[PDB]
Amino acid sequence: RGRRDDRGGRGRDGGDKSNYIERVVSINRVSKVVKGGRRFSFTALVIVGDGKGMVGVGYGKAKEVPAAIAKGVEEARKNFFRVPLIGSTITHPVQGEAAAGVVMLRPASPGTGVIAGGAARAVLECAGVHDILAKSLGSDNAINVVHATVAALKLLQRPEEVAARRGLPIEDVAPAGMLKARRESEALAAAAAREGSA
Amino acid sequence: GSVIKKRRKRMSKKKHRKLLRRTRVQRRKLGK
Amino acid sequence: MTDPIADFLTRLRNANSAYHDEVTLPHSKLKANIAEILKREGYISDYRTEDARVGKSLVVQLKYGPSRERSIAGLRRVSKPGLRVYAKSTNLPRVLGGLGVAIISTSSGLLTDRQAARQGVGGEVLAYVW
Amino acid sequence: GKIIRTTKKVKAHDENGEAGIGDRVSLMETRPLSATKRWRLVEILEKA
Amino acid sequence: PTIQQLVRKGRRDKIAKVKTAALKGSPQRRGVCTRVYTTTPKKPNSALRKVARVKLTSQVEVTAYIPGEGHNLQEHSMVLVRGGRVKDLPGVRYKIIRGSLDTQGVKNRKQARSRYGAKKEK
RNA sequence: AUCAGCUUGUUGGUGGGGUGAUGGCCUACCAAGGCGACGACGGGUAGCCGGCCUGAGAGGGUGACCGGCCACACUGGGACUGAGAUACGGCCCAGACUCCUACGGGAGGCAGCAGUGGGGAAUAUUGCACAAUGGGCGCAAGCCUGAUGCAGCGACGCCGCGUGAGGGAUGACGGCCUUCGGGUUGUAAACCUCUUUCAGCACAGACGAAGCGCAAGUGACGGUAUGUGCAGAAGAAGGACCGGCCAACUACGUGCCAGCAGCCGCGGUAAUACGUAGGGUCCGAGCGUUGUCCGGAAUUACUGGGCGUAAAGAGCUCGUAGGUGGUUUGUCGCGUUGUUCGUGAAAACUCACAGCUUAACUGUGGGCGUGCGGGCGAUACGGGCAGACUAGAGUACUGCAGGGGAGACUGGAAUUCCUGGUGUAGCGGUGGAAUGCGCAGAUAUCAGGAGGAACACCGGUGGCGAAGGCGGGUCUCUGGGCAGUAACUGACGCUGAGGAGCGAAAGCGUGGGGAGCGAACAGGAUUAGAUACCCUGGUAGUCCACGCCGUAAACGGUGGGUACUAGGUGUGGGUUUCCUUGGGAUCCGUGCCGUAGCUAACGCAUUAAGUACCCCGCCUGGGGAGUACGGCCGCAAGG
RNA sequence: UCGAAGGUGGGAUCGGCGAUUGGGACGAAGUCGUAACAAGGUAGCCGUACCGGAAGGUGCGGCUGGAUCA
């Protein structure tokens, strides 16, 4: 990924809507032996997302690096994924496993900061979280820890969803501090939203 | 798995057996 | 047969994982109290106690959602024989951030984590379900 | 956290020989009555 | 595993794995140097490495490497050996301090400057 | 436990003795215990703690300062004095050492504060005061105090401040790159105002003392801190690093050299990795290196790991301690839990506040002190005791299947030899041959005899056994399994550290037996050469009796038990409902395919590697090495 | 009576050195072969026994982590 700063007198750079947040996690040239030598190709693990908390995971195969990055962008574009939150935190401590990828995603009080390793830091920095506390146990990789983090975010659910599963009136599903954090986060959603209307 | 591990182990074992052939006598008498 | 309640919750994880409608069990007192707690929190739908070969039996129907999806998203026996886990009042261990619940058998009977918090008594855990 | 069952071979003092093997005796701590005989037993509960 | 098996016996750490046997848990030891011969490393790295084997005060016989361009030390110099690591010659894991008791600092060294012991230009 | 037994004042009793006090503390007698796989007795190391460091915590490391206990005072014994003794600057004795001696005999004791030598990578002055606080004696004054208070020394640590500020160009001199245009150093510099902390020189000069004192004075630190003045940018910056991780790049110089490096790895005349230069980055009175510890390391995994093939399931069972325990009524309150009392010194730690120009620092008030003991309460769960139950477990009864085992007797086909026929020159063997047996009568064929071993066909993805393993037949003795009824007992269950037993083949001992096969051992051939394959011969062995040994890819590479989790189709054992052998249903077994789920992947998949509980074994990078040393078993090989 | 040191005695146990010797690790490159990986040119491996300059070879039983398919 070099020589991107450019000014063209051509038709268009085609800049348009959906200015999302896009992170390229790792690139390892992938070789293939054929008759008389090696054929080098490229893999780019592409994270895309918006600051609401919708995450994509794309996996680009091409024999050029920006081609593989662009194919990962289109593949994560094809496949988004909804993550439920509280304010800008996570709901409750989970462990995700993608066959060797263990990631523990635990919430924290706000202000602490996204503390995670670089793959999980990528998937969570694209997402709508600002203050959680994760760790990547096992598998020491990028692909399995990204995919394990997304499986960990599939083990998430709303407080309300849990209440619904059990047919119980909330209050009765959460404890009270987390309901107060719901009041804080929806209150600042009201303040920034009504400042957004004017 | 592979048989290479098995064969390294067995090389050690063989060498040792031989070493006890040749020193058999000597170990008996030097020990007695 | 070494742990009764592990076979109970084990049979609920298997019958929950394999999309079953009901389940049948050897009835006992402690399984009746756990079945009554999981009634009162709504993780299972309802249980009925039959008479059968020699003893009574516990037939639990499981509560599913708007399609085939499950309400009990897991069980885990923690106060297991060999490491029976005890809990003072300071912390009735919170489960799944509070969204899950903790079946805690205090001196007043069998309670949940929240009931062990407000009523001011602790003294066990048992399995906690989310 | 394993609740370990442990034993303790204390030594104890019967003046009247009221206890025998297998009994459920009480104990109470005393003055050091000899080299590790630091217990005397009152109100023996059950005999064998 | 089967927690009563850990109540019986289990779960101890492995081994301290001591790095240097200079002695005493001491950072550098002065030493009488003998036979300052120059060696040949492993196969991807071919050169001549300027080692000297040193009898540390701690009575042990070791073999240290002399960093820098050349060595002021001849036979029977009082060199101050610290512990290091040179991959390249097997069994030599100690480095002689340059700019020390006997062995003078490296001359015209102008950039590295703390290692190799070159004093500042007047 | 590569230390399994130790102990004879040793274990208890009585009478004395001793002590401030209980007591094998001591003694006489009597009794003969006591302590140990919850590790006794031995070996190694070590002062212990409040704490400190690290860590999300759990935990790991450590025991410096400060504080609390303990032990010792040249080495080793002993008492005396005294309210109280390891009696550091006491005594007595014996040692080792230093010293004085008129040679008769004496003297010493820094592990007090300084200080010297030595050892060492390394650790300070032979300081000044009792003004303050503590201590002693004294009616008091007062005297003593290397405790203490302070000072000196070392960037040894932690914190604070300084080495100037503001202006200043289409950006000078110089430097080094360059695409030869220029670009960087660089607003930085020179210059122009301004301000001076801190060092400098002046003069003033403390608090610490609501103190002591009956004397009139008294502060070691101290003419220090600190004030108010004067002069002037005036006296004040360095060290590492710039391949990757990991903020930061260019040229020149050497071109597998000289060197670098924490790991990966850089040097073979165009190195952003070596050396020098510019330039950048990061820190800053410091900055790098080495050592030691925690972290990252979920890499000893309680929290928080594993064992089909990656390291890892004992060859297989039986069973001692141990761990663990179905249904249900009562009782106890040992585990658990609630509450209150006591305690966890101070300091530290954390929160708030106050004090020093700020901070480090210090103080005040909370919390912490995760614990332990006493009182009172609760009884679900665990446990104890006392009971009850029949589903687990075992027994009885009726059957049923089977190379389960041992002993005994016996059967035929085939190979070899033997005697006798019939009968001749080849047979045997090979990729091709030759050693070899023959021509003395072989191989071939017929009749008879000996002797040994193995059991064609049935017989296979089939049966039985715990695992090894088990197939000619019959008889004798004996072991287990399965189903059916439910007659009995009433939780008697599960696992099982050590332990005993069984355990292919090879091998070992003593005595038999010895047909075939056959290591070793010959010859032949092949080959460069065969100490090999292939050929001809061939001893131990293979066989039986009696014992050893204890190993295997002893493999399902899968410890044992239990409950549950879509199915489909074979086959083995047995009960029953229906068609009337067919189908169904059921309990136990063994295969092939297959969902869910699981796995690193292959795969597994109701006979789990799925979901859970109980107990055991075992693993912690590869070699070194299942080896040395030591012990145990063994006739030895060896385990 | 007890009793420190001293003396005599025979042992335990921890080490240091020892001529010679066994193996082990590394070295580049030397000599000798070619055992293993493809049916590796005789399928490999386990146990054990015997033999051989060496890798190894053979026997007895086992195993697929074996092959092509009579």
Curated annotation (Swiss-Prot), chain A:
GO biological process: translation
Record-level Gene Ontology MF annotations: rRNA binding; structural constituent of ribosome
Gene3D superfamilies per record: 3.30.160.20, 3.30.230.10
S5 DRBM domain span: 20-83
Signal peptide limits: none
Entry GO terms, CC: small ribosomal subunit
Biased composition (Basic and acidic residues): 1-18
Highest taxon listed in the record's lineage: Bacteria
Pfam families for this protein: Ribosomal_S5, Ribosomal_S5_C
InterPro entries named in the record: Ribosomal_Su5_D2-typ_SF (IPR020568), Ribosomal_uS5 (IPR000851), Ribosomal_uS5_bac-type (IPR005712), Ribosomal_uS5_C (IPR005324), Ribosomal_uS5_N (IPR013810), Ribosomal_uS5_N_CS (IPR018192), Ribsml_uS5_D2-typ_fold_subgr (IPR014721)
Keywords, sorted A to Z: Ribonucleoprotein, Ribosomal protein, RNA-binding, rRNA-binding
PANTHER family: MITOCHONDRIAL RIBOSOMAL PROTEIN S5 (PTHR48277:SF1)
Stated role: With S4 and S12 plays an important role in translational accuracy.
Name of the protein described by the UniProt record: Small ribosomal subunit protein uS5
Gene name of the encoded protein: rpsE
From Swiss-Prot, chain C:
Coiled coil: none
GO cellular component, one term: ribosome
GO molecular function: rRNA binding; structural constituent of ribosome
InterPro entries in the cross-refs: Ribosomal_uS8, Ribosomal_uS8_CS, Ribosomal_uS8_sf
BP GO terms, sorted: translation
The entry's keywords: Ribonucleoprotein, Ribosomal protein, RNA-binding, rRNA-binding
Protein task: One of the primary rRNA binding proteins, it binds directly to 16S rRNA central domain where it helps coordinate assembly of the platform of the 30S subunit.
Similarity comment: family membership: Belongs to the universal ribosomal protein uS8 family.
Record-linked NCBIfam families: PRK00136.1
Assembly notes: Part of the 30S ribosomal subunit. Contacts proteins S5 and S12.
This protein's name: Small ribosomal subunit protein uS8
Originating species: Mycolicibacterium smegmatis (strain ATCC 700084 / mc(2)155)
From Swiss-Prot, chain D:
GO cellular component, one term: cytosolic small ribosomal subunit
Quaternary structure annotation from Swiss-Prot or TrEMBL: Part of the 30S ribosomal subunit.
Keywords: Isopeptide bond, Ribonucleoprotein, Ribosomal protein, RNA-binding, rRNA-binding, Ubl conjugation
Gene Ontology process terms (BP): translation
Protein name: Small ribosomal subunit protein uS17
Sequence position, cross-link Isoglutamyl lysine isopeptide (Lys-Gln) (interchain with Q-Cter in protein Pup): K47
Organism: Mycolicibacterium smegmatis (strain ATCC 700084 / mc(2)155) (Mycobacterium smegmatis)
UniProt similarity note: Belongs to the universal ribosomal protein uS17 family.
Segment of the intact protein contained: 50 to 97 of 98
Gene: rpsQ
Annotated GO MF terms: rRNA binding; structural constituent of ribosome
Protein role: One of the primary rRNA binding proteins, it binds specifically to the 5'-end of 16S ribosomal RNA.
Swiss-Prot record, chain E:
Tree of life domain: Bacteria
Protein function: With S4 and S5 plays an important role in translational accuracy. Interacts with and stabilizes bases of the 16S rRNA that are involved in tRNA selection in the A site and with the mRNA backbone. Located at the interface of the 30S and 50S subunits, it traverses the body of the 30S subunit contacting proteins on the other side and probably holding the rRNA structure together. The combined cluster of proteins S8, S12 and S17 appears to hold together the shoulder and platform of the 30S subunit.
Region (Disordered): 104-122
Keyword annotations of the record: Methylation, Ribonucleoprotein, Ribosomal protein, RNA-binding, rRNA-binding, tRNA-binding
Residues with the 3-methylthioaspartic acid modification: D88
GO biological process, one term: translation
NCBIfam families per UniProt: rpsL_bact (TIGR00981)
Keyword rRNA-binding: yes
Subunit structure: Part of the 30S ribosomal subunit. Contacts proteins S8 and S17. May interact with IF1 in the 30S initiation complex.
CDD domains hit by this protein: Ribosomal_S12
Family label: Belongs to the universal ribosomal protein uS12 family.
Protein name per UniProt: Small ribosomal subunit protein uS12
GO cellular component term of the entry, any: small ribosomal subunit
Pfam families, per the entry: Ribosom_S12_S23
GO molecular function term, any single one: tRNA binding
Ranges of Basic residues composition bias in the record: 107-117
